[model samples]
Target: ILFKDDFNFFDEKVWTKETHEPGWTNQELQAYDAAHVSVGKDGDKSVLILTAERKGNKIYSGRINSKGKKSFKYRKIEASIKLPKTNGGLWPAFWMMGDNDKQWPACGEIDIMAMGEQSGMAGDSEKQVNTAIHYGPSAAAHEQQYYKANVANSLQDGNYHTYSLDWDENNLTISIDNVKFHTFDISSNTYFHDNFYILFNLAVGGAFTGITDINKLTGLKDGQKVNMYIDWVKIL
Candidate 1:
């Protein structure tokens, strides 16, 4: 998962120079920050690391798609990340989705970890951290499940945490630091059993976060440093 200038973020081979591709937007304005992310053995600390610059004021984001090519099955995915706190407009996530040929419900999405700028209490959940499964055509308006990481009390902007999702033939569950918070049963919705791929990125703001503050937009100079890290993934 090392993103060097000559690497691809998708295939994990080379980086893509293009910014804001179609079906994607520059919400986070995450231009290639040179060589900031890597995966390898760092002494005894063997893990994937990313040194991302955070801009709470400036918005930026990465691009991805789960279309036919990105599907998988019976996988355990996890990401380790450190965050920061500021004024407004900061959205980060580690999630998965179905390919382009299928639309939600039919083409589902699973959010292992999702935190929006307005996560404190924007939705009816009255929570700060959120985890959910989307299974419907209307996108957000589908047969969904929600969980409150309840990290709001302890999750500050400076500490790092591990978020993960476990998907098997029976069900899918989201967890934080090994503590299961939410789960969706495939028996109730077979969509949970279908194959899907992963998507990891730091989105500043958009339909997912509902952040439109001019100051929080990307490219603003406020000494912001935002980043997400991946520890590992094992697919069986």
Candidate 2:
């Protein structure tokens, strides 16, 4: 799980930081000052906290792709975490990318959870979350596996939710709070032939959503601690 750059780096341990220039997402904050991200302990668990207070830009991204540690052709993956509510294009997501054996899209992707909101609407589930997968070429291969479950109702701001995946050779299912919401099958689509690893990150803004105004993020002030929490991760 990923959050805005905070203090503790527990959230960042599983990830590798990739900073970028502004204007990529058409957002205000273009560059993230990576000097402040850190790691610490929350109760007994380690934590990663990023405190960002950039006036017009911030881009501190933590990318954890479970490519080498564990590659799965078919298995179950899950994680529990909460999200920041004060939003300026804050995106919290749990997904998987193809391993080194394959390229993206053609390799397939399973997006377990994605929540985002405009400036100042951090915790409202009604405003910030959407789910599905990325497949096919150019990563535009989109599928809405479940329309009735298009929105995730189990998560709220300041609280944690479990986003999970159940995968078999030809089938991949996504769920929120144990409720089955979406699925994809390989028997019909050729994208799932290769192995993929889990990915978790918190991006403030990006071209994926066309919201490049990173400076509008609320609760973002220099030295302000913002974070995403991950209770645990399971892979089978």
Candidate 3:
């Protein structure tokens, strides 16, 4: 394996929690605080958990990345995750971004798994997980290939589901629980051939969540805390 994180501890050398104010790119309302992250253990097994909580008049959450620290290319990567309860307001993602070029779109974006898609059917946020590739000349001219997995209520069943991505210059494939659902021809693809770093984040009310108003976040209360869990991550 090229990299692995069982989350035995908060590996500061491997992952960095990004601290930023809300409204970064998305209409999200959560402030990214380094304090939102913690590691928990179940006997010998451990997991990383990101907690999104309401503090005073604002919401706080966690966003982390492996940029200069770790990366992969033309290989397989995976993560075991258990998302927080879904709503029109809470969104979480396991994805990678290009380390080749600086600017986005012209760079590359691969969303291996994401919850709370905007175009999903009613209550799809609870039963669905989507995958997509975004790459193009510019933001206004961006192009993407997207797919949604029915998952049959597998997600949020209080179990950690494995999400895997096998990528090469030839093609890209994604699967959950060893069940492959989406594959794309990437022989002529321009953006994903370079090194990519990983990212895990929990967002509150972004455009992807399809809800921005705080009053509409559903289930969220002054003392309610949402949790997103990562049992492990590996690149091989």
Candidate 4:
């Protein structure tokens, strides 16, 4: 009940920034670099920033996870985050993955909050978040536990919203700003009972955002930048 970090300093012992080439999972456009991750100020307090922007012929961003350094089971995970403007191809998420030897889907994936990549036509992409759990006996037999939940306001506004997942062996409840939006039973799958680690990343031009061409991102022209601000994170 006491795992907490306000990012006063990037504790490498607890978090690890990962590097990946562009076109990694999700068909995302950004190359993940440690340089894109930094701990910065928010007035009097400190916060973590994962910036996504273009540089020359490529886009760069940050992706960090607590794979081996930190992990938990059946705990409430909360993060105070501020999303970037829904600029065509920007995708930022707060998710988790199983900390086992098994690969994805089999290892299990949990999306506590994912922005961008609206399943619907051309709207609400900026205001809503998708929450889901991915797992199955195998990759080809993949399955996801998800239910659409509406957010009443723009999550990209220059403000911080508390996004949380109250998880247990039998269920997972997702919420925003202390208001419960969705809850689902996980009794059918044993994957939800495994140890999981945290992850925060910002991706550009992903399949979910539907912008395959760098030139197509109306909001991102050239070296313009967008950021995902995370004030704090905790497990209780």
Candidate 5:
């Protein structure tokens, strides 16, 4: 394996929990608190727990990245994940970004798995997941290829599912539980050749998820807490 995280414990050597205020580019409403991420046992399996809670008009959540700790190139990245049943403003993601000096889209981003607030607003079975590649020389000329899947077995149903991205010199393919969903030719894309780091986050009321009004949200209620679990993350 190129890298693996079983989360037997919260290892600072493997992951870095982020602590920041809201409005992290996407206009996300939740403040990323390091305290909201931890390692816990789910029966006999060691899991990573990311919690998102609303308290007194304020929202708190978790975000962790292997930015300075781990980076990979042209390797298969996979993770077993279980989502939270939160409101329309809750957005969860498992993605990667190039370890480059360029900002944003120019640095390149690969979204291995993501569930937007739109899915939570639509109810169970109607929830959807997405896999995408974002790249371009600049923001004005930015471009992306996307793949979307409707979660037939709701992600919040308490079952862990494997999400994977197989990358090689030829192409990049994304799959869920071994079922391939999207493929992108990489022969012409040079940005993805660089090393990339992993990121796992649970954001609330973000602009990309179309959460314009948090006060009118309906999925996760105020004062309620929701959790996203990661059984393992591996690269080979």
Candidate 6:
């Protein structure tokens, strides 16, 4: 095993909560605050809760990264997560980025699990989780390979599901509940050859959430609070 996080505590040595204002990227509206993150026992299980709440005209959420602390290459990683049931302004994700510190897309990005606003839009109960790879040299040369869940298994149905990534120099496979859903050939791609660190965040009113007006978003109201729960993480 490469690394693991049972979330019994917020390991200051392993993770750092990013402090940034809205528009970090994708025009997100939530300001990442360390106060929104907590780790403790949830009944008999330890969990990492990333909360998102509204304050006045602004939104607040949590973002934690393992960069500079833990990183690996050509390994398998998995985590169990339960999404929050909110509205069109919430975007929660479990992802990774290269440790090179190079510009985005150039350094590489791997999204193991991501749920957008479409899932929680008014009258919508079908949440779709996606996996994607973003890489290339520059913005114009940037390329992305995305695989979306199109089934009835909504990720926000108030249940924990395991998301896994089996990656090597040959290929990258994404799976959920041990069922493989997507694979991308990376034999000729150099992006996955470098070490990458993990990240967890709960964003509100982002581009992925498709909310141009956070106040007018459907299915959620101002000052509404939601949560993203992570049960555990393992690397092999």
lDDT by residue (14-50, candidate 5, tens digit) is 7999999878667788889988998998888899999
Q: Top lDDT: which candidate number? A: 4
What would the per-residue lDDT of candidate 4 be over residues 51-114, giving only the tens digit for each residue? 9888776899999999988999999999999888875778888999999989888989889888
Writing each residue's lDDT as its tens digit, candidate 2 over 1-236 gives 32232333443344554455554433534354454344566577655543333442444544345466556676777776766653445566777777766455566666777765442142453334555655666546544342223344536556667777887777777777787777666577766657776666666665444466544445455545567666667665
Give per-residue CA lDDT, model 6, range 67-177, as digits (tens).
999889999999999888655567789999999878889989999888774544543534566678999998889999987664457777878889899989998998888
lDDT of 1 by residue, 52-105 (tens): 354543334343333444466667766665543422545566677775567656
lDDT of 4 at 138: 92
Q: Which 10-residue window in model 3 sums to the lowest lDDT? A: 117-126
Clashing residue pairs for model 3: none
The lowest-lDDT stretch of 10 consecutive residues in candidate 4 is: 117-126
TM-score for all models, in order of appearance:
0.66, 0.72, 0.93, 0.95, 0.92, 0.92
**Full-model lDDT for every candidate:** 0.54, 0.57, 0.85, 0.85, 0.83, 0.83
Q: Give the Cα-based TM-score of candidate 3 against the true structure.
A: 0.93
Note each model's CA RMSD in angstroms. Answer: 6.0, 5.5, 1.7, 1.4, 1.9, 2.0
Give the residue spans of candidate 6 off by over 4 A: 117-125
Provide the clashing-pair count of each candidate structure: 28, 34, 0, 0, 2, 0
Error of 3 at 99 (Å): 1.5
Q: Is candidate 5 or candidate 6 better by lDDT?
A: 5
